[PDB]
Paper text:
CRAF (RAF1) is one of three RAF-family kinases that initiate MAP kinase signaling in response to activated RAS and is essential for oncogenic signaling from mutant KRAS. Like BRAF, CRAF is regulated by 14-3-3 engagement and by intramolecular autoinhibitory interactions of its N-terminal regulatory region. Here we describe cryo-EM reconstructions of full-length CRAF in complex with MEK1 and a 14-3-3 dimer. These structures reveal a fully autoinhibited conformation analogous to that observed for BRAF and two “open monomer” states in which the inhibitory interactions of the CRD and 14-3-3 dimer are released or rearranged, but the kinase domain remains inactive.
In the fully autoinhibited structure, determined at 3.4 Å resolution, the phosphorylated pSer259 and pSer621 sites that flank the CRAF kinase domain are bound in recognition grooves on opposite sides of the 14-3-3 dimer. The CRD is nestled in the cradle of the 14-3-3 dimer, where it contacts both protomers of the 14-3-3, both phosphoserine segments, and the C-lobe of the CRAF kinase domain. Arg156 in the CRD, introduced with the Gln156Arg substitution, is positioned to form a salt-bridge with mutant Glu587 in the kinase domain as predicted. While this engineered salt-bridge likely stabilizes the autoinhibited state, these mutations do not appear to affect interactions in the open monomer states described below. The CRAF kinase domain exhibits a characteristic “C-helix-out” inactive conformation and is oriented with its active site facing away from the 14-3-3, where it is closely juxtaposed with MEK1. MEK1 also adopts its characteristic inactive conformation as expected. Structure-based superposition aligned on RAF reveals that MEK1 is rotated by approximately 5° in the CRAF structure, but in a manner that maintains key interactions with the CRAF kinase domain. The MEK1 activation loop makes a short anti-parallel β-strand interaction with the CRAF activation loop centered on Phe223 in MEK1 and Ser508 in CRAF, and this structural element is shifted toward the CRAF C-lobe as compared with its position in the BRAF autoinhibited structure. Finally, the interface between the CRD and 14-3-3 appears to be somewhat more tightly packed in BRAF than in CRAF.
Author numbering:
A (entry chain D), D (entry chain C): 2 to 230
B (entry chain B): 62 to 266, 307 to 380
C (entry chain A): 138 to 184, 254 to 264, 341 to 629, 661
The structure:
């Protein structure tokens, strides 16, 4: 049943329909079986495309909304549709977060899995941060910061600095610091320390972890260059 | 102190890829001037830099180098006031006469060598454009060089020119290798061979500009037709047209070189010949 | 580095290998390299076919006495531009040809008719020609400054989306030109004008019979115009007629490069003959490291392909337009900090 | 207001969300008023994207179904997914057809509108024809052929050879001939005649619509080269 469901998730991924994949993996992990590496990777990518389609839609609608704030009534419809997209964006994230708190995070019997799921939770509260405004923004960014710090401590304690998941966690932590927490200096410092602690020990990567690790390093390169100031 | 409104054109002295030169009259002093109009569009600060580096030309005075009155920017063009030359450039006399007799060829070559040596030693200013159209002769017989690269920024600005038909560049400059006054010596030699024979002697007795560059880069240098010139002139053009700058001789060898001292020793009344062939 | 993932392109997309219509294929997430499933075999990663259906959609001359020539504006490779007031502000170019050959004149008449048939928003109008003041042509006057003057002498500051839409408008104009079987020889920034401040107007297109000198009743078939924007294959002139769509693509690529760097190519070489020799032999190319840091990879890739040394590898202008519009649509998404992308989700 | 749904659908278009665009366009055409040039294109594009996503999904699922070649339940679940996306596809096609023959084709005074709607009808019946095999295949094939012929007559009579609608109808009808009816000879004949007629009036390509026209011409060329080999 679980193997059938993961095969269905792969098929839905190859078929470009991600909502079916998201539902299939969600009800894969609702059962309560130990989530292996490929399963949790499929879950993360499924929810990532599902959330990212609507996230890009939200970016587009906000950008087209802020072309000229002093305009006609049409902007009201634009903001109403943006609020509708958020209403169709916050609840999906909420589903992922509840799935993490109820099932994923609790039965995590591997420190790599634990830091991966905590990075997931921080990521999804970070996604909630942009759509949230006012005190709700502060409340959601508190959860994202706590999840990120908890992931950071275990990543230091258990994993290597060159581990691709650890590098991704550091990258996402820096993105969280200067996109919401508006701490460009601290975010750049975090990116630089992750970078130099990673390149201080090179040519020791696993053959499978060759493309991904260097890909995250190049992403860190661009982000540092983008906000060197 | 030079302005656009102070000058009016009498006729057209010449034309080329760089620009067009007109004869104008200076009201304060009452002498006819050759005003070169080169069209170029660069930054105002670059305009000031070009004017400043052209102001170096005030002290570049020699009997074998054309003088300099003043340079100014009127409208999108760098107008350079030069000492008007009556006998034009050697290109006009090549158009008029079938070929330059070897004596006046020696005279112009020694004039070029002396002037460019003067420039190298007293100003270290690179000519870079030794061409038959860039060397001028007078009715009285004076031969002076013109249009040399005092302003490197002017060179950079003029780099965006249009494609020409013929070239007088040494093979080392086209390849981008190190270039010295040796390249100017090559260019002078190629110009001399241009003068001696009656045509552009890249295909020695309808050819693309890039094809000409390929000819002068990947083929042996041309040689003048034997039997109608002296052996000294032949060895002069052979030594001047050497692909490798190392084996080619520098200015010190040119000054002592045999064809040079033989040309200097002889006295030729070429002013009258020139006045007959251009009048 | 290619993050190839299956993607069904719902917009106007063209394969980057076969340069044909692409509707299902694989797209790289970080740059945007796209290709067909069947093209995978012939794909040089460098970071069963079904018939294609319908994609988604959405006075003979001028008399000289009628014109009045105002103060001279400037000079160029083959003409001198003057201000005119013939039915409004116009531009009159006095061609350098003094005594046109009768065959040359007939060919020029054919070409001026061909250019008169065209009418597009992104190009300057071609009104007609005159014969009294030697050989002259009349084009639409653009009160706006040239793109070359904007970039270098005036140094007008432009944000990156403005640069992108300028490139888009130029590509639209040249796509229209190539649609009418017109090879815009002599294409450079001095011929691009920022009308009304931002709108791109392309001028001085065609006119092969006038730009090239005539050695009697036959065309010389010699290069003419600025060296920096000239294509390698037309600089070489190993063929009688190397002017094609790909030479225009290379010229547009040089324009793109100087747009995305703010400076002319081969800035370290300051002599025209050396530039001719190196570009002809392939020794010199517009170095991309000068491109702006904030430049999207897609623009860097596009300007890289547009200036390809081999003629056949240069993409046609419909492809260039499609890539530019795709980048314009992707601009709002990627205009912020980047995070962890999808990992190794590649097929086969 | 009916315009409100119009630029709501347009905003969903630039937001990449085509399911809301499809529903908005459906509601707009439900009002029983004649569509403008922009709204008709918007509706056609919206449903084109909606059916195209499912068509690509169906092609992929059928390709794995033919690729596994084993003895298990994997092919059974692949067939289940295929039939699910197939019934979803049929629902979309029947919805757009019911819109077509009840609000669009019956109310089409402009002949070019009639050609567009008949071309859409033939396209959608072809879509059902390539997914439905059996006794019901012949009926939908006949409906698509009849709609294509009805569009063909009007395009030949009162439509220019270089019009994008006429060239697109010719391309779609030739694809119908080659794929559905498996006859390459008459498909090549029709496509050749269309291309030659387009080449004859080549100079008639205005600035308002030239890119699409030459795009169709190039696609016709590619289709000819594919068929003749
Ligand atoms: N002082 C002067 N007196 C008389 N004629 C002159 C004077 N200065 C320049 N000219 C003429 O104007 C022309 C200007 O062209 P130059 O720039 O000197 O050389 P050129 O022929 O343009 O070489 P290229 O390769 O075309 S740039 C000369 O060739 C002469 O014919
Ligand atoms: N339609 C126009 N409207 C306004 N200024 C123009 C127009 N066409 C040319 N100019 C100006 O004329 C000068 C350029 O002269 P041109 O002879 O066109 O040289 P060019 O721009 O190098 O193009 P060519 O001749 O095709 S090599 C510049 O000052 C331009 O801004
Ligand atoms: O004009 C030039 N070369 O000619 C070919 C195309 O113009 C020329 C080229 C480079 C240069 C650098 N600084 C001045 N430069 C020139 N001008 C010039 C130089 C010396 C004198 I005395 C008088 C002049 F007008
Ligand atoms: Zn890539
Ligand atoms: Zn392809």
């Amino acid at each position: 049943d679980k193997e059938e469901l993961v095969q269905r998730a792969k098929l839905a991924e190859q078929a470009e329909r991600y909502d079916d994949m998201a539902a299939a993996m969600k009800e894969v992990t609702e059962t309560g079986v130990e989530l292996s590496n490929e399963e949790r990777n499929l879950l993360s990518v499924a929810y990532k495309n599902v959330v990212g389609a609507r996230r890009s839609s939200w970016r587009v609608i906000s950008s087209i909304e802020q072309k000229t704030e002093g305009s006609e009534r049409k902007q009201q419809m634009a903001k109403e549709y943006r609020v509708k997209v958020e209403k169709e964006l916050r609840e999906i994230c909420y589903d992922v977060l509840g799935l993490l708190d109820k099932h994923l995070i609790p039965k995590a019997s591997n420190p790599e899995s634990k830091v991966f799921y905590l990075k997931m939770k921080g990521d999804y509260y970070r996604y909630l941060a942009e759509v949230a405004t006012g005190e709700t923004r502060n409340s959601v960014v508190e959860d994202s910061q706590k999840a990120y710090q908890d992931a950071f401590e275990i990543s230091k304690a258990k994993m290597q600095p060159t581990h691709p998941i650890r590098l991704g966690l550091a990258l996402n932590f820096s993105v969280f610091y200067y996109e919401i927490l508006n701490s460009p200096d601290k975010a750049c410092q975090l990116a630089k320390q992750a970078f130099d602690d990673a390149i201080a020990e090179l040519d020791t990567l696993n053959e499978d972890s060759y493309k991904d690790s260097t890909l995250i390093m190049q992403l860190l390169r661009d982000n540092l260059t983008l906000w060197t100031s | 102190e030079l302005k656009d409104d102070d000058f009016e054109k009498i006729s057209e002295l010449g034309a080329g890829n760089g620009g067009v030169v007109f004869k104008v009259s200076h009201k304060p002093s009452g002498l006819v001037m050759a005003r070169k109009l080169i069209h170029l569009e660069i930054k105002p600060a670059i305009r000031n830099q070009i004017i400043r580096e052209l102001q170096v030309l005030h002290e570049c005075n020699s009997p074998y180098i054309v003088g300099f009155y003043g340079a100014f920017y009127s409208d999108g063009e760098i107008s350079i006031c030069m000492e008007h030359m009556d006998g034009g450039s050697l290109d006009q006399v090549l158009k008029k006469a079938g070929r330059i007799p070897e004596q006046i060829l020696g005279k112009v070559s020694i004039a070029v060598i002396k002037g460019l040596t003067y420039l190298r030693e007293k100003h270290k200013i690179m000519h870079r454009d030794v061409k038959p159209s860039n060397i001028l002769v007078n009715s009285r017989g004076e031969i002076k060089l013109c249009d040399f690269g005092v302003s490197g920024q002017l060179i950079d600005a003029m780099a965006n020119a249009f494609v020409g038909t013929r070239s007088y560049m040494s093979p080392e400059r086209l390849q981008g290798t190190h270039y010295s006054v040796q390249s100017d010596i090559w260019s002078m030699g190629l110009s001399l061979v241009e003068m001696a024979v009656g045509r552009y002697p890249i295909p020695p007795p309808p050819m693309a500009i890039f094809e000409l560059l390929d000819y002068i880069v990947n083929e042996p240098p041309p040689k003048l037709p034997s039997g109608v010139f002296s052996l000294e002139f032949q060895d002069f053009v052979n030594k001047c047209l050497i692909k490798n700058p190392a084996e080619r001789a520098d200015l010190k060898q040119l000054m002592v070189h045999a064809f040079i001292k033989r040309s200097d020793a002889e006295e030729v009344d070429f002013a009258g010949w020139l006045c007959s062939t251009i009048g | 580095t290619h993050n190839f993932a299956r993607k069904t392109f719902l917009k106007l997309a063209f394969c980057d290998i076969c340069r044909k219509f692409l509707l299902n294929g694989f797209r790289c997430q970080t740059c945007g390299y796209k290709f067909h499933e069947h093209c995978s075999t012939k794909v040089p990663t460098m970071c069963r076919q079904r018939s294609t259906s319908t994609p988604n959609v959405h006075y003979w001359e001028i008399e000289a006495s009628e014109v009045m020539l105002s103060t001279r504006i400037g000079s160029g490779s083959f003409g001198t531009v003057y201000k005119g007031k013939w039915h409004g502000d116009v531009a009159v170019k006095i061609l350098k040809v003094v005594d046109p050959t009768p065959e040359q004149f007939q060919a020029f008449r054919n070409e001026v008719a061909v250019l008169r048939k065209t009418r597009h928003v992104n190009i300057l109008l071609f009104m007609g020609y005159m014969t009294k003041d030697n050989l002259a042509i009349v084009t639409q006057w653009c009160e706006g400054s040239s793109l070359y003057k904007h970039l270098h002498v005036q140094e007008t500051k432009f944000q990156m989306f403005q640069l992108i839409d300028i490139a888009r408008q130029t590509a639209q104009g040249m796509d229209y030109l190539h649609a009418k079987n017109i090879i815009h020889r002599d294409m450079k920034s001095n011929n691009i004008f920022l009308h009304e401040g931002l709108t791109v107007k392309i001028g001085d297109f065609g006119l092969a019979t006038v730009k090239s000198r005539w050695s009697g009743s036959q065309q010389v078939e010699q290069p003419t115009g600025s060296v920096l924007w000239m294509a390698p294959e037309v600089i070489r002139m190993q063929d009688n007629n190397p002017f094609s769509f790909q030479s225009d693509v290379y010229s547009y690529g040089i324009v793109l490069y100087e747009l995305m760097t703010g400076e002319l190519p081969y800035s370290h070489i300051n002599n025209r003959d050396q530039i001719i020799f190196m570009v002809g032999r392939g020794y010199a190319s517009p170095d991309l490291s000068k491109l702006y840091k904030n430049c999207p990879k897609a623009m860097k890739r596009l300007v890289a392909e547009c200036v390809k040394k081999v003629k056949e590898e240069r993409p046609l202008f419909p492809q260039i337009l499609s890539s530019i519009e795709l980048l314009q649509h992707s601009l709002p998404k990627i205009n912020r900090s980047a995070s962890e992308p999808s990992l190794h989700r590649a097929a086969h």
